[PDB]
């Protein structure tokens, strides 16, 4: 079976099983990876440029406004490649995902398995004068593929889908790997308050800190498997433990939850029910009259104001500190202008391989995300007054501008929820005394360690003369292609109608033209965005 | 028993760059990449604006004087170190991050009898959790173009602790640190203890 | 306590006396008076994420 | 599995297990060897030049001072290659070794195993005019690798790490083998006393002695295994029996061991305790007054004076006869001058492959070794007097200059201890009626025979015409690469604090800059020296 | 044992035991306290300077 016998098999499908109360989703995915010879065989540690728009030192125009962009960092570059199925688009066909968000309220992940077979390694031999050279691709029956997977998570994570670097979303195209590399400590700290006018900026510390620097090769961390052609590999089943993520969006605010303020029903249509003057109810503060639905007591609050957009200048900073996920559509925001970015708003740049139509072209999305309302707290629109009494506040004692964090013990908020195709699936939980309460971009945060990372490198083939010179043309050019078959099982409880009138069922974005989501004459098509969070529901 | 050097910038996938051929040289940032971003930014794609599912450390007003019944008193901030900034022992000695100073008698390990000595833990090894509120900013809208003079603010002084943040306790301290502490009975207990 | 195992290749900086302090002050004197050192600690680096 | 199936596997790690009283260390190492076709297929015996700085005959300037350098010898050159893991740097990651010398008092070796798989043999075919020739590397599915291991130790040793010739210290780089060859008797004897003034030098005997010469091929000594590609090989577990080597350095001398001479404690600080005039105690000689701590009796002595540096002119000589391992730091010696070489002081030259940063460059170390004090006996500083009495000696009867061996039944001394990375691990014990009591450079000396040597040669592939002419271009050019996975288990008892105040824990050398021990932008880095012998302890 | 018999004992040490995966630390401490007669035998409640 080593040669002339195929070890692996192709399965790409997803199947549902309803037990009458809960759904079990088993989704298979298999891809054809094109792996290439590592640029250098040795680890490296180096420091980087700040970025395209970062100012050259001494540019005080725009003051410290333009310093946010770096994008400066320092890292160790391993000669390894990282195949991670952390995107949603891997596992779910667009129509097979549409059935998930349609029929299910919320979902968990259970298991993940991975298998690498069957390997094919070839070498490039160019014979000819040069003007008319002829390449010849002939395979090495004896050559190695190195497969390193760390179940103990000794390595830094760097498997997050961000900077997409993930397997393609289209089963029949080939995939390219991205190189595995991770951070080592450095100080980017930037002082933007320097000056007599406080406006000017400068950078006090830059560069790598070598005293405490940690350097972890792949060889020492994990056990490596050397695979020839007839070999196969498997990671074994990995069981997540995670909380379910809601598939439904909340339209309620603190105003939409409660007992509505008693009013007199209209006799004729159209008419508006008048507010009843004399009622009895709890109120905040000293108010007796008027009794209002704004000042009425409630035992929790929904959403919180946050400074946006916060630039944290840290070691390595600046960086953004996220706010709430709410939608700006209740305010004047629309796609096509004025396009308010206020609530935490993610924008996905993606390659042709990730579902762009044009080859070698870039496209973006910018999730609004328009369906989350009632969680909307936009700090520029807010106020506080000193004393709460029957009379309205004086000109003094009433403030409106800040810009303050209202997160507190009472607040209740929602995560962004899953996102398709480009959303990450799971994420690692940092080890600190206080773990985050909820994750920003990742639906699932592994309680125990995250699924081990799977690294792959094409073992070097050397020419007869190893050292010469000078290290010039030491290895013979080589490339490999292998197949990767994963499966992950999910568990979801199915939705039942809670209302009388008909829902608006999920689907393609509203304005988009349906021809762009189905292949073209050339064969290029784009996958749709599903939020989702595609169904409304009641919070309270 | 271990200190964290990572910040929100040190955690993640590093922004793709082109490795240097010669030493010393710096790897140039790749112009065209694909990745998530906050806000409406498409170009430039930056490592500052890139999305991450949690944040490390939080800005805090310092030093807060709470005037209470019996007050004033200090309300603590994060335990981070000021060594990434210009702070050094022997000047300028920034007290910013929560910084404890231990006065101790001869009986407690001072050499001279009947004499007093101090320490002032920095604590220099906690970095990447460092958020010093005077150095921070917020801008109204996040877009490809940099913010206008208006809509970009820097001075506050606001609490960024939220559901996303991840932070560290001061950890044990020797010799003078306390070992255990009592938990107050309230409906909301503290999530993490400052000195104990 | 659960014991530490090396997670890196190169050698750590192991804990000890504060950097600038003179080691003679932590061991008894002619009169017999000495001072104990500060250990943080939190004396080892590690990875958060 | 012969073709297309990978026999071997990659494991490079070391793991500790504490039983609460003793540590068990299991360290794996695996390397990628690049083996090349032997220069000639036939054994050879030949004589060599004296050396670079050895005088041409009749050069009487410098007298016999410059004759020490040869470096002259005669040997039999086998067409075989020797892969020996005799260095410490093979088995221990720098941080994984730092934990050994930190937590353990002393250590033994228990077992060693070795495995050679998986073999890849290729041939070089150059087709083209010559101006624009194109090499083509295509593998021989049928070709042999010869693996010879002698468990019975019929061959001379020549496996000592000296002249480093050992596997690299960095797991991801490739290794080159060194050719196996050993000595045959010869007479180099040099007379440096010839002349009327006794100063001039000449060589009386030179050349090989063919009468009693012993010639041992590899084929007759050991059984050889012929391995094709799909084959694997293993040496079986080899159990050492050896004594533990101390991980701690001794600061005590004969003066530091004992009961201190009674004195009157100082009342104020700072002050010095005055020596008590009238005490009762044993003394050497006839001394009653003054009673001194120098003349007081003690039942053993520490360290011994030795002539340094002794040049033994032997058959094949000159050579150095070692002294004690002590440090010169108590005297005026410092790195950066004046740099006294007196105590036995080893200097390690090492290649890029052995942990030098620059490729094809040489670097040195010169272990001081600064931490061994109290064993320091430097013969130029010493004296003897005829009679030991109350009065000090006369001008006559008091001598200071020699230069004499004080090793005797009373003396107690220390071996150099292990050394990292470049130190040897084990060594062979010569068979003589009097074996050495302690080894100079090697921590472990096998009581029984040493671990068998592992020789490997690439079996010859012949062109159709064997004899032609004339022996011109008889074999087709060929090279091979295979993987070598050893493991050796150690046993060590863990250290517990014997003092109140905090230790100085082991680590990087003091003055060195930490950035040089972690990879560079190009990826080149250097391993640190650990002594060690990194902890102080009490001798007595 | 009430008089002329010593009830207590002096142990000041700490000892570690490694199970190969986890450490068990047992630390003893013993001190000699000098206790003095209370200034007043009665409880008190009072207010202080700033």
Residue numbers in the entry:
A (entry chain F), D (entry chain R): 33 to 572
B (entry chain Q): 279 to 474
C (entry chain Q): 524 to 572
E (entry chain Q): 33 to 82
The authors write:
The BuVs, along with CuV and TuV belong to the genus Protoparvovirus, which prior the BuV discovery contained only animal (non-human) infecting viruses, and are classified as novel Primate protoparvovirus 1 species. The VP ORF encodes for two overlapping structural proteins, VP1 and VP2, sixty copies of which assemble their T = 1 icosahedral capsid in a predicted 1:10 ratio. The VP2 monomer extracted from the refined 60-mer capsids of the BuVs contained the core β-strands (βA–βI) and α-helix A (αA) observed in other parvoviruses and large loop insertions between these secondary structure elements. However, unlike the animal protoparvoviruses, the bufavirus capsid contain three separated protrusions surrounding the 3-fold axes, as has been reported for members of the Dependoparvovirus genus, human parvovirus B19, and the HBoVs.
Movie frame micrographs collected for these VLPs, at two different cryo-EM resources (West/Midwest Consortium for High-Resolution Cryo Electron Microscopy and SECM4) yielded capsid structures to 2.84, 3.79, and 3.25 Å resolution from 29,596, 7564, and 5234 particle images, respectively, for BuV1, BuV2, and BuV3. For each BuV, the first 32 N-terminal residues of VP2 were disordered, and thus residues modeled for BuV1, BuV2, and BuV3 were 33–568, 33–567, and 33–572, respectively, with the last residue being their C-terminus. In VR-I, two additional residues are inserted in BuV3 relative to BuV1 and BuV2 and VR-III contains conformational difference among all three BuV resulting in Cα position differences of up to 5.0 Å. VR-IX is mostly structurally conserved among all three viruses, with only the BuV2 residue 540 being conformationally different, VR-VI and VR-VII adopt different conformations, with BuV1 differing from BuV2 and BuV3 at VR-VI and BuV2 differing from BuV1 and BuV3 at VR-VII. The melting temperature (Tms) of the BuV capsids determined by DSF were 64.9 ± 0.2 °C for BuV1, 77.3 ± 0.3 °C for BuV2, and 73.4 ± 0.2 °C for BuV3. The Tm values obtained for BuV2 and BuV3 were within the range reported for other members of the protoparvovirus genus, for example, MVM. BuV1 contains five cysteine residues while BuV2 and BuV3 contain seven each. BuV3 does contain two cysteine residues, C59 and C520 within the same VP2 monomer, at a distance of 3.45 Å, positioned to interact within a hydrophobic pocket, but they are not engaged in a disulfide bond. This proximity may be contributing to the stable BuV3 phenotype compared to BuV1. Significantly, in all the structures determined to date for parvoviruses, either by X-ray crystallography or cryo-reconstruction, there has been no disulfide bond observed, despite the fact that cysteine residues have been positioned within interacting distance, similar to BuV3 C59 and C520.
